[PDB]
Ligand SMILES: CC1=C(CC(=O)O)c2cc(F)ccc2/C1=C\c1ccc([S@](C)=O)cc1
């Protein structure tokens with residue numbers, strides 16, 4: 001599992017559960033090809049998005065549907081979504097955890113890039 | 116000045132200076148039209164991107180060129196950019212401060228939305 | 232104004248207003264002496280805590296009463312407070328902006344340290 | 348394991364490894380009694396700090412030695428440490444993950460309070 005997404009809710013201090021995550025790879029024409037997607041689990045994690053075969057070097061976008069998340073909770077969000085865009089680079093560390101911490105008017109994302 | 120962008124560098128504990136910021140508005144046809152752009156000043160702030168008249172309702176995207184920022188400091192950052200996408204002025208005109216704090220492998224973005 | 236505290240509310244996308252802030256300086260004997268205190272204003276800022284003369288080298292603790300803040304909004308937050316502890320003015324006098332972003336179960340604190 | 352600490356490095360995008368964490372419980376006299384401590388693992392996690400028997404209701408402080416961490420990496424830190432102070436409350440959710448994301452001049456902490 002070379003790409004994992006973990007999402008946390010900073011309002012309720014919980015995994016952000018059932019958050020839609022779409023992953024895109026930048027095509028040669030600079031458009032975003034849908035690549036992988038899913039909903040975060042009860043631990044706010046999304047595993048099995050890609051394999052080490054499929055996850056080649058390139059620019060990827062992780063799109064977290066934070067707005068849907070907040071709407072389901074009855075809380076007014078600011079952002080349309082949380083968009084994480086990064087170059088997956090073969091060279092060094094290669095397991096990516098994309099950690100997102102969500103608040104209605106704020107989010108942070110962090111990459112944990114390991115071996 | 117209804118849309119301000121402020122960028123802080125979490126490594127240096129300083130404003131993130133000369134950070135390129137590009138603003139887009141989603142068009143009727145769902146593409147991103149170029150709305151405004153600028154560089155953060157010495158204070159890490161970007162003022163004067165737009166006006167009350169111009170900043171109409173819509174979905175805007177603020178793309179903060181965090182990569183060039185880190186690169187020019189010799190740091191190969193994780194993200195290509197920090198982009199904040201939001202519906203603006205849905206309940207009437209507001210002042211938006213897009214506050215972003217940058218680390219090579221992390222950024223956070225906060226919105227300060229005030230009613231003038 | 233060498234020490235400013237700014238507090239943002241990440242739930243409301245607003246300044247965190249009337250947030251009690253207490254500043255302590257570690258004494259020669261290692262206890263926390265009360266240095267200054269105040270409430271964040273409408274802008275979520277707290278200015279005038281100290282002066283260049285008073286703000287001498289030392290280890291300071293800024294305790295942000297984030298709990299009362301959330302409580303008065305009907306929210307039972309996780310943390311009792313947000314406290315930022317730092318050595319100030321080690322390389323000569325600096326201006327410190329303690330920037331804090333609050334969510335009921337999370338807070339972040341950033342330091343903007345500038346040389347006047 | 349009712350109290351876990353996870354620390355991440357936002358500069359290197361990695362678990363924050365070998366970070367000293369001290370946990371304190373507020374004594375009746377308002378002093379902080381040392382309670383539990385440890386170093387974060389290679390995954391930036393600190394498990395086994397307490398047990399569900401020992402971890403009673405009360406005000407706890409998690410003190411993360413972020414300054415030592417940054418010094419070992421040759422990076423000038425701002426904070427002396429990251430201090431997380433919270434009331435452990437029996438009532439509801441009761442497994443605490445204290446997540447800290449570290450930068451030299453910034454940190455955030457988040458509580459993941461689960462069942
Ligand atoms: C350690 C850690 C984890 C992993 C875990 O909890 O097991 C995590 C997962 C997320 F989805 C989001 C954040 C975190 C986290 C620390 C953290 C990161 C950013 C912020 S922002 C800058 O406020 C705060 C805290």
Ligand SMILES: CC1=C(CC(=O)O)c2cc(F)ccc2/C1=C\c1ccc([S@](C)=O)cc1
Pocket residue numbers: 107108121122123213214215216223224225237238239328330331332338339340341343453454455
């Ligand atoms: C108060 C405040 C300001 C305004 C100012 O200093 O004038 C700001 C500006 C930025 F460009 C970025 C962050 C902040 C901030 C608090 C803060 C926000 C996110 C984080 S992340 C979640 O670690 C931490 C702290």
